[PDB]
Amino acid sequence: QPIDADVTVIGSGPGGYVAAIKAAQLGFKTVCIEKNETLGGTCLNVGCIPSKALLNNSHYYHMAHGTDFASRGIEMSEVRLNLDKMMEQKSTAVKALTGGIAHLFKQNKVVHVNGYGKITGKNQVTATKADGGTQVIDTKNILIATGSEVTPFPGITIDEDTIVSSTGALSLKKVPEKMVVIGAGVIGVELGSVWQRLGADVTAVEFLGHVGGVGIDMEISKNFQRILQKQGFKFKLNTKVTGATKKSDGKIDVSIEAASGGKAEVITCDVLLVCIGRRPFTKNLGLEELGIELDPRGRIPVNTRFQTKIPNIYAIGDVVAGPMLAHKAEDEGIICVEGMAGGAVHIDYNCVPSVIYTHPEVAWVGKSEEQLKEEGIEYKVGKFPFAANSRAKTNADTDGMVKILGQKSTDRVLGAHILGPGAGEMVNEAALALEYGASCEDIARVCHAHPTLSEAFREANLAASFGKSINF
C-alpha cells in the first residue's frame, strides 16, 4: 500500500498547508503529513490564532469593565468575567479554522497522511501512526515544513499548569493572582497583557533593555513600554531569571538578578510563563542519515530555491532562517512550490512586517533607526501622533504615532513603525509601499480617505518628505 506523489509536505503548519494547497493547484500530486490530531500547526492550534482571540476578548472586557464604555453612554450594572465562555469563543474559532484546512485539502486533492514522517530515502517518506501504523510515500520531491517548539529553560521544567509555556498560558483555568513572564518578546508581551487585562498582577522580567524583542525600533519600544506600564503591566528589564522552584504552599519563587553583576532578589507568583523563545523542530526527520547537517541554531540551511544540500529536498518556515512568523512561512511555502514548477523564487525578509496585537497595537516593516545607523545609511524622519489624527480622536483612542524613515536623498521609504490603533492592518499598506520602492512623497500624495487612521501614515511620510505634516 505505498502511495506515490510529486510533492510530500512534512508539516501542516502555515508553511506546510499553504504549500500543499499551492502545489496541488499548480498540478502536483500532493501529500501533506501531520503528526498532530489536527492540521494547522503551531499558529492555528496554540499560537497566533488562539492568542489573538484572547487578546481581542480581553481588550473588550477591559472597555466594558473599565471606564471606556461608561464614557460613551453604555451603562452596565456589574461587568463579570466568565473565563469559561471566553475560552469557548477561542476554541470555537480554532475548531472552525482547523476544519477549514481539512476541507481545503479535500477541495484541492491534497492527500492528508496522519503520522510522524521520517525521510527514509532520497525519494521516500515513511509516516508512522501512534498505533504503530505505517504508510510509505515514494515522492519526487520532499518539502520539510516541520516548524518549531518552545525553547526550554534549563532548570525550570514546564508542567503547563503553574509553570507554563505559551500553550498553557492560553488555557489557564482561572485568572492568576500574580503572574510573572520570563522574557519580554512579542509573545510574552501579548499573553502578559491578556491576563493583566483580566485582573492578574503581571510582571515581565527581561534580560535586555527594551521590550518587544529583536528588530523593534527602540523609540517605538520605549514609548510602547511606557504605555503598557501605565496600564499596569510591570517590567523588570536588564534582569536575568536564574531559576525557579515551587513552594510547598503552592506559589512559585523565581530567583532573579541584574543582567550583569547580581542584585540577586526573589519574587513570588501564582503562575510562571516561560517565554524565552522557540527553536526549529527537526526531531527524527532523518536528516543526519541524508547528510543534511543543521546550522548552529538548529536550522536547515537552504539555497535561494529553498533547496537543502539534496536538491529535491526543500525546507521552508520556522525551521529555516528568517523571522519566525506565520506569513513568512506561508510565503516561503508558496514561492518554493512555484520554483519546483520552474518560476522565479523571491523574498526579501526586509519587507516581512511584524505585528504586536496588544492595544495599542505595534507594527513595522523595513528598517529600524538602529539598523540604519549600524548600516551607515543617511536618513530623515517623519512623525505623526495619533492624537492629531481625526478617526483616532473621534474614536477616543489616540494612543501612539506613525514614524517614517526615508533615505536622505532618494526620499525612499526605508522603514515604517506604527505604535497605536490599527497598526496591525496599517503595516500592510507600508509593506506595499516598500515593495514598489515608494518614496515619502509618493505616499504623501496618495489620496487617503477621511477620516481614517491611515491618514497618520500619510502625514508622517509627508513630514519626512516636505518637512511638516498638515495636522501637526
Ligand X SMILES: NC(=O)c1ccc[n+]([C@@H]2O[C@H](COP(=O)([O-])OP(=O)(O)OC[C@H]3O[C@@H](n4cnc5c(N)ncnc54)[C@H](O)[C@@H]3O)[C@@H](O)[C@H]2O)c1
Q: Which of 5, 7, 9, 11 binds ligand FAD (CB under 6 A)?
A: 11
What is the closest distance, in whole angstroms, from the C-beta atom of residue 412 to a second copy in the complex? 14
C-beta atoms surrounding 369 within 10 Å = 18
**Catalytic (active site) residue 450:** yes
- Of residues 65, 112, 448, 450, which has the active-site annotation? 450
Which entry of a second copy, ligand X, ligand FAD, none binds 194, CB below 5 to 8 A by partner kind?
none
Q: Which of 263, 297, 342, 409 binds ligand X (CB under 6 A)?
A: 297
State how far the Cα of 355 lies from the Cα of 423, in Å rounded to an integer: 8
Residue 87 binds to ligand FAD (criterion: CB under 6 A) = no
Site for ligand X in 221-280 (CB under 6 A): 240-241, 275-279
Q: Which of 223, 319, 422, 460 binds a second copy (CB under 8 A)?
A: 422
Site for ligand FAD in 29-58 (CB under 6 A): 33-36, 41-43, 46-48, 51
Interaction mask 264-303, ligand FAD, x per CB under 6 A: -----------------x---x------------------
Secondary structure (H, E, C), 264-312: CEEEEECEEEECCCEEECCCCCCHHHHCCCCCCCCCCCCCCCCECCCCC
State how far the Cα of 110 lies from the Cα of 17, in Å rounded to an integer: 9
Cα torsion angle, 184, 185, 190, 194, sign: negative
- Residue (178 or 305) nearer to ligand X, CB: 178
Site for a second copy in 117-136 (CB under 8 A): none
Q: Do residues 236 and 256 lie in contact, with contact meaning Cβ atoms separated by under 8 Å?
A: yes
Count Cβ atoms within 10 A of the Cβ of residue 123 and give its class: 0-12 exposed, 13-18 middle, 19 or more buried: middle
Q: Do residues 116 and 135 lie in contact, with contact meaning Cβ atoms separated by under 8 Å?
A: no
Radius of gyration of the chain (CA): 24
Cell numbers given for 142: 520532499
Interaction mask 179-218, ligand FAD, x per CB under 6 A: --------x-------------------------------
- What is the DSSP secondary-structure string of 103-124? HHHHHTTPEEEESEEEEEETTE
Residue 389 binds to ligand FAD (criterion: CB under 6 A) = no
Interaction mask 122-161, ligand X, x per CB under 6 A: -----------------------------x----------
Q: Do residues 438 and 447 lie in contact, with contact meaning Cβ atoms separated by under 8 Å?
A: no
In degrees and rounded to multiples of 5, residue 123 shows phi and psi of: -125, 40
Which entry of ligand FAD, ligand X, a second copy, none binds 277, CB below 5 to 8 A by partner kind?
ligand X
Site for ligand X in 182-201 (CB under 6 A): 182-187
Q: For residue 201, what are the β-bridge partners?
A: 178
Strands 271-274 and 178-182: what pairing?
Answer: parallel
The set of catalytic residues is 450
Residues comprising the binding site for NAD(+)? 183-190, 206, 241, 277
Residues comprising the binding site? 34-43, 52, 117, 146-148, 183-190, 206, 241, 277, 318, 324-327
Binding site for ligand FAD (CB under 6 A): 10-16, 33-36, 41-43, 46-48, 51, 116-117, 145-148, 166, 187, 281, 285, 317-318, 324-327, 329, 450
